[PDB]
Amino acid sequence: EVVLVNVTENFNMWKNDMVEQMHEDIISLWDQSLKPCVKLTPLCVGAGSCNTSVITQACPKVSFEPIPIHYCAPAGFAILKCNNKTFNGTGPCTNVSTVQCTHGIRPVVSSQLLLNGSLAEEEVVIRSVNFTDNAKTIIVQLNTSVEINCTGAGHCNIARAKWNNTLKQIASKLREQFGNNKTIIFKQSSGGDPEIVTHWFNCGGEFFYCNSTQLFNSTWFNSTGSDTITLPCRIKQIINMWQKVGKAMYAPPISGQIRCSSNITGLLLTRDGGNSNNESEIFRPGGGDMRDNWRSELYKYKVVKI
Amino acid sequence: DIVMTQSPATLSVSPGERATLSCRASESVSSDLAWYQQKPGQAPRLLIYGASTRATGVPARFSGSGSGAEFTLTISSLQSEDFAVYYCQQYNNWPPRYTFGQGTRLEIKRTVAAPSVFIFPPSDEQLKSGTASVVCLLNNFYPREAKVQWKVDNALQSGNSQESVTEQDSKDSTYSLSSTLTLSKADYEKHKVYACEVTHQGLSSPVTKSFNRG
Amino acid sequence: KKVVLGKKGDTVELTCTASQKKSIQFHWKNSNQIKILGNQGSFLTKGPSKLNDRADSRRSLWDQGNFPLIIKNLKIEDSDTYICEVEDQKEEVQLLVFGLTANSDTHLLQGQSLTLTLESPPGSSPSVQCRSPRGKNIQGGKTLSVSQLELQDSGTWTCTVLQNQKKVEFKIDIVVLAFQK
Amino acid sequence: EVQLVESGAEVKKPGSSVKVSCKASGDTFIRYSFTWVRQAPGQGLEWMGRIITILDVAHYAPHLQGRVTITADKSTSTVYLELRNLRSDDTAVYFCAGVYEGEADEGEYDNNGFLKHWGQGTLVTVSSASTKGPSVFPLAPGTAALGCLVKDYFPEPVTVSWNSGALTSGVHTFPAVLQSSGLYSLSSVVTVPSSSLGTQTYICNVNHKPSNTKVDKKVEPK
Ligand SMILES: OC[C@H]1O[C@@](CO)(O[C@H]2O[C@H](CO)[C@@H](O)[C@H](O)[C@H]2O)[C@@H](O)[C@@H]1O
Ligand SMILES: *[C@@H]1O[C@H](CO)[C@@H](O)[C@H](O)[C@H]1NC(C)=O
Ligand SMILES: *[C@@H]1O[C@H](CO)[C@@H](O)[C@H](O)[C@H]1NC(C)=O
Ligand SMILES: *[C@@H]1O[C@H](CO)[C@@H](O)[C@H](O)[C@H]1NC(C)=O
Ligand SMILES: *[C@@H]1O[C@H](CO)[C@@H](O)[C@H](O)[C@H]1NC(C)=O
Ligand SMILES: *[C@@H]1O[C@H](CO)[C@@H](O)[C@H](O)[C@H]1NC(C)=O
Ligand SMILES: *[C@@H]1O[C@H](CO)[C@@H](O)[C@H](O)[C@H]1NC(C)=O
Ligand SMILES: *[C@@H]1O[C@H](CO)[C@@H](O)[C@H](O)[C@H]1NC(C)=O
Ligand SMILES: *[C@@H]1O[C@H](CO)[C@@H](O)[C@H](O)[C@H]1NC(C)=O
Ligand SMILES: *[C@@H]1O[C@H](CO)[C@@H](O)[C@H](O)[C@H]1NC(C)=O
Ligand SMILES: *[C@@H]1O[C@H](CO)[C@@H](O)[C@H](O)[C@H]1NC(C)=O
Ligand SMILES: *[C@@H]1O[C@H](CO)[C@@H](O)[C@H](O)[C@H]1NC(C)=O
Ligand SMILES: *[C@@H]1O[C@H](CO)[C@@H](O)[C@H](O)[C@H]1NC(C)=O
Ligand SMILES: *[C@@H]1O[C@H](CO)[C@@H](O)[C@H](O)[C@H]1NC(C)=O
Numbered sequence: 033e034v035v036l037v038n039v040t041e042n043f044n045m046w047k048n049d050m051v052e053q054m055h056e057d058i059i060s061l062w063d064q065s066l067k068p069c070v071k072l073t074p075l076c077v078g079a080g081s082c083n084t085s086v087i088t089q090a091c092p093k094v095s096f097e098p099i100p101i102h103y104c105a106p107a108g109f110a111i112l113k114c115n116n117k118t119f120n121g122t123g124p125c126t127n128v129s130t131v132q133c134t135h136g137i138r139p140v141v142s143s144q145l146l147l148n149g150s151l152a153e154e155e156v157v158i159r160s161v162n163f164t165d166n167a168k169t170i171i172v173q174l175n176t177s178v179e180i181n182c183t184g185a186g187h188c189n190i191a192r193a194k195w196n197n198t199l200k201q202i203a204s205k206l207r208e209q210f211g212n213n214k215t216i217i218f219k220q221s222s223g224g225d226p227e228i229v230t231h232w233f234n235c236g237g238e239f240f241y242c243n244s245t246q247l248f249n250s251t252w253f254n255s256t257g258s259d260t261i262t263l264p265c266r267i268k269q270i271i272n273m274w275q276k277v278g279k280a281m282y283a284p285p286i287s288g289q290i291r292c293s294s295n296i297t298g299l300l301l302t303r304d305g306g307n308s309n310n311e312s313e314i315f316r317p318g319g320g321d322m323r324d325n326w327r328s329e330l331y332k333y334k335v336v337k338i
Numbered sequence: 339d340i341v342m343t344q345s346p347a348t349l350s351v352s353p354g355e356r357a358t359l360s361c362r363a364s365e366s367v368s369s370d371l372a373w374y375q376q377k378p379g380q381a382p383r384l385l386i387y388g389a390s391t392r393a394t395g396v397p398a399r400f401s402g403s404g405s406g407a408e409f410t411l412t413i414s415s416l417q418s419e420d421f422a423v424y425y426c427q428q429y430n431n432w433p434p435r436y437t438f439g440q441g442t443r444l445e446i447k448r449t450v451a452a453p454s455v456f457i458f459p460p461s462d463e464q465l466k467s468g469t470a471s472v473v474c475l476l477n478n479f480y481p482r483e484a485k486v487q488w489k490v491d492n493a494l495q496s497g498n499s500q501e502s503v504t505e506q507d508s509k510d511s512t513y514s515l516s517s518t519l520t521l522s523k524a525d526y527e528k529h530k531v532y533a534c535e536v537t538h539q540g541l542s543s544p545v546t547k548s549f550n551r552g
Numbered sequence: 553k554k555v556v557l558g559k560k561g562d563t564v565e566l567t568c569t570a571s572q573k574k575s576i577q578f579h580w581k582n583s584n585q586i587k588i589l590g591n592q593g594s595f596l597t598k599g600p601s602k603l604n605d606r607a608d609s610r611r612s613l614w615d616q617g618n619f620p621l622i623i624k625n626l627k628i629e630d631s632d633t634y635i636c637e638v639e640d641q642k643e644e645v646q647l648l649v650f651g652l653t654a655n656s657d658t659h660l661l662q663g664q665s666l667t668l669t670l671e672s673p674p675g676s677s678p679s680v681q682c683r684s685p686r687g688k689n690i691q692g693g694k695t696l697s698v699s700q701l702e703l704q705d706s707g708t709w710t711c712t713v714l715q716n717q718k719k720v721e722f723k724i725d726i727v728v729l730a731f732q733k
Numbered sequence: 734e735v736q737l738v739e740s741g742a743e744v745k746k747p748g749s750s751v752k753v754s755c756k757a758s759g760d761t762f763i764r765y766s767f768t769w770v771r772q773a774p775g776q777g778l779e780w781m782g783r784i785i786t787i788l789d790v791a792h793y794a795p796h797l798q799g800r801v802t803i804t805a806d807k808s809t810s811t812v813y814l815e816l817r818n819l820r821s822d823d824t825a826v827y828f829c830a831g832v833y834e835g836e837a838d839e840g841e842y843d844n845n846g847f848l849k850h851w852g853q854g855t856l857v858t859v860s861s862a863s864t865k866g867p868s869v870f871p872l873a874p875g876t877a878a879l880g881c882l883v884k885d886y887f888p889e890p891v892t893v894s895w896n897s898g899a900l901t902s903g904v905h906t907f908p909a910v911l912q913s914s915g916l917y918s919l920s921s922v923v924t925v926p927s928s929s930l931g932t933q934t935y936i937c938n939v940n941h942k943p944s945n946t947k948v949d950k951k952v953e954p955k
Contacts, residue, residue, distance in 0.1 A: 088433045224589075281785075314600075339795070441778075
C-alpha cells in the first residue's frame, strides 16, 4: 500500500501476535461451522479422579469450503509488511511497507502438506526458529505449486515427475542449510497420532487420512517410476481435535462423489538429527500445530503500536 | 418423541400365503428403520435394517420397503417358522431417542373350531385352606376370540375371575383358555350352582357348564 | 542428577512439569539427542527412537502443565539419560532398568542350590540383598547364590536392588519340594 | 460375530437398585456399541439407552434419564445396566443387544442404531412380595380333561411337567396371572382318553427354583 523509504524493521515470524489472533479466530470459525455429534475433552485438574466433559449435539452434514480472510489493523496499531521477496522471516527487513490489510488467507487446516497457500516469488524457501534443533518444525515454501487430486473413494493422486522435481528443489535448499556434502533423505513419519502420521485434511466436510509414505521415500545427492503417485486414503469419523486436547465424532458421509483438487504450496518437515557423524540428513513430514500453518502466510507481516 | 405405529395389531394368514405388515412414523425417519421378529420366550431377531437391507441369515422371502414415514414388511410365502410377533424400530434421531412400534402379531389362519368346555370345582384340600378356585377350561378352539361369563345362582359375576390363554398350538393351530373364579370359602358356601358360560364363533348358542356345590 | 529405577518388563512414568497449568510445546530426547516423543499443538508425535512402539504420554495432563514420558515393557537397554525440553528449560532424568531371575523356573529339591542373576545396564554397579520366607539373607553384586535350600525357603523371596541411593524391589517365587521320609 | 450372555434373574423390592451384566464374546469389544432394551410381561420392546463403547459415552431414553446408568468394562468385555429407585412397573425382561460399528480403533464409526446381536434376557421382578413356593391342588377329571392348579407363588417362573416328562401330548400349561395379592397363579391341564382313568396314574411335577421347591401331585378321578 505505502512503501516506507529508508526504514529498517526487525521481524520475528515465530513471535507474531497475528498468528495467535488468527488461531483463535479459526477455532471460533470451526465451532459454528463444523459441529461434531459428540466431543470429549479431558479434565484432570482435581487431586484424583478425572472428569471427561462430554457434549452431544446435532451434527448436520454440511459442505466446508475455506474462504479467504483479510486481517486489517486492530484499533491502535498498524500492519507492517516486509517486501524482500526472499525473507527468512527473522531479522532486519530493509524494504518495509505499511499496509491496510494482509492479502487474502485461506485458513486451511492440514498436516504435512500446506495447501492453497502462497508461493515463494523466487526460489524455494525453508524457515525454522532453530535449524540446529531437531525438534523444531521446518516450514517449506514452494515456488511452484503441485496439484493433489483426492476422492472420497479412497485415494489422492500426485504427478510423479512434478513431485520428484519438487523434492530435488527442497533437498538443494536443505543441503545449503545443513552442509553441501550431505546426503538428503526423506522418510515417512516416525509415528504419533493419525492426524500427524498421515497427510490429514478436510474435503467436502469429511476428514481424510492419506498415507504419505510414497511422497517421502527418496535419497538425494547420494551417488553419481509410475506416471502418477497414488496415495491410499481413509475418511474417518472419530478425529483427534486440533483446537485443543480432545476427540470429536462425526457422522458418516452422505455423498458418493467427494472430489477436490488442491495446490500443494508448502510443507511441514522435521529433521531427525541426533549424534550421528554420518554425513546425511533425514527429513520426515510433520505438522499438527496449526500456528505453523498460519505462520507460513503471516511470516512477512507484523503489527505495531502507532 | 417419534411414535411408531404398526397395523394391524394381529394379522391372520393361511400357511404359504403372503403377509404384509405396516409401520408408520409420526414424522420422517428417512430410511433408518429396522424390523425384528420375536417368538415367545426368546430375544428379538433382526430381519431388516436401513428399511430394505436383509440381515445375514434372513431368507429372501422377507422384504422391507418404504422411506420417510411409511414402511412395509412383506413375507412372500409364510412358512411354519414365520408366525411370530414383528416389531419396527426407528433410529433416525440425534441425540438418540430410538423407539419401537407396539408390534404386529402374525398368527396361523385356520377354519373355525369350537371349544370343548370343562368345569372344575375347588379341591377339598384348597377348601381346607380357606379359599375356593373354580376353573373353567376352553380347549382347542379357533379363532382366539372367546367370551366367558361366570354366573353364581344366575347372578352374573364380575371382578373375581382371571383369564389366561396359551400360545397358538404348533400342530393344530388352536388356542386354549382358562378362566378362574376365586372366592373365599365363606362366600363359596353361601351359594349353590356355579356355572361358566362360553360364547364363541364355533358355537351356535352359548355353552354352559356347571355343578352344584356339595 | 535425578535418578529413577525401573524393572524389566514394568512400566515407568518419567515426569515433566511446566511453570503454568497450560498445554505448551514439549519434547523428550535421549542423551544422544534422539527424539523420543513430544507434541505438535494438541497432537502427539513420536520420534525415530528404539522406544517408539513402547512410549506414550498422558494428554489428559497436558492442560495441567504435565507432560510425562511413559515407557512400557521396559528393556535393560532403555537405561539412558532422558531430557524433557519445555519452555526453554531442560529437565534431566537418568533411568536405570534392572532384571532379576532365578536360574531355574523348575521346582527345586531340598539341599539343592539357588542362583539369582541381576541384569543391569552398562556402567551401573548395584548392590543386591535378597531374603527368603524363613529369613535367609544373601547379599551380592551381579549374582547371588544359596548353596543348599531348606524346605522353609519355599515361597516368595524379596530382593532389593540398591543403586544411587535409590532402591527397587523384586519378588521371586521359588518352589522347594517336600518329600515323605 | 459376538455372543451376549447375560447375568441371572433378579428379585428386588421397590426402592432398591439393580445391576445386570452382559458378557460379550467372540469379536473385538470396542468395535461394537451396546444397547439395553426391556419388555414388560405382555408388552412391547422399550429402548432404554445405548453406549458408544470406544468413546465410553452413553445416551438414554428421556423417561428413564436420571436413574439409569450404562457402563462397559473393556478389560472384561462386559456391559452393565444399573437402574436405581426401582418401581413395580420396572418389572420386565431386560435385553442387552449390540451391533458392529466398523474399525472403531481406526476411527471408522457408522453409529448404527439397529440391533443385530441379542443376549438371552434377564428377568427383573420388582415387587413387595416375599419369595414362596406354590400350593398345588388337583383339577380332578371319549376324552377327559384333568390338571393341577399351581397357586400363590413368587416370583416367576414356575415349571411344570407330567409323569416326569413321560407325558407331553395334550398338555396345556397356561401363562401365569398376577393375583391382587401380589402372588402368581397358573393351571396346567391335559386331555387323555377317559378309558385311561383308574388304570393310568397322572402326576403333575411342579418346580419353583426361586424357593427351591419341588412338588408332585397325583391327580385322581374324583
Ligand atoms: O420409554 C417409553 C417409550 O417407549 C415406547 C415405544 O418405544 O413404549 C414402550 O414403553 C412402554 C412403557 O414401558 C411399553 O408399554 C411399550 O410396549 C413399549 O414399546 C413409547 O410408547 C414410549 O414413549
Ligand atoms: C534516504 O536515502 C537517500 C538516498 O541515498 C539518502 O540520501 C538519504 O540520506 C536517506 N534518508 C532519507 C530519510 O531520505
Ligand atoms: C464431574 O463433573 C461434572 C460436571 O459438572 C460434575 O457435575 C460432577 O459433580 C463431577 N464429579 C463427579 C461426582 O462425577
Ligand atoms: C521495495 O519493495 C517494493 C515493492 O513494493 C519494490 O518495488 C522495490 O524494488 C523495493 N525497493 C527498492 C527501491 O528496491
Ligand atoms: C535471516 O536473514 C537475515 C538477513 O536479512 C539474516 O541476518 C539472518 O541470519 C537469517 N536467519 C538466520 C539463519 O539466522
Ligand atoms: C533481502 O534483504 C537483504 C538485507 O536484509 C538484502 O541484502 C538482500 O539483497 C535481499 N534479498 C534479495 C534477494 O532481494
Ligand atoms: C524454483 O526455485 C528453484 C530453486 O529452489 C529454482 O531452481 C527454479 O528456477 C524456481 N522455479 C521457478 C518457476 O521460479
Ligand atoms: C538451537 O538448538 C540447539 C540444538 O538443540 C541448541 O543447542 C541451541 O541452544 C538453540 N539455539 C537457541 C538460540 O535457542
Ligand atoms: C488433477 O486434476 C486436474 C484437473 O482438475 C488435472 O489437470 C491434473 O492432471 C490432475 N492431476 C493429477 C491426477 O495428478
Ligand atoms: C503407509 O503405507 C506403507 C506402505 O505400505 C506402509 O508400510 C505404512 O505402514 C503405512 N503407514 C500408515 C498406515 O500410516
Ligand atoms: C521406498 O522407495 C524405494 C525406491 O525408491 C522402494 O524400493 C521401497 O520399497 C520404498 N519403501 C517403502 C517404505 O515403501
Ligand atoms: C526423478 O524421479 C524419477 C521418477 O519419475 C526418477 O527415476 C529419477 O531418478 C529422478 N531424477 C533425479 C534423480 O533427479
Ligand atoms: C493450482 O495451480 C494451477 C497452476 O497455477 C492452476 O492452474 C490451478 O487452477 C490451481 N488449482 C486449484 C485447485 O486451485
Ligand atoms: C483448495 O482449493 C480448491 C479449489 O477452490 C478446493 O477445491 C479445495 O477444497 C481446497 N483445498 C482444501 C484442503 O481446502
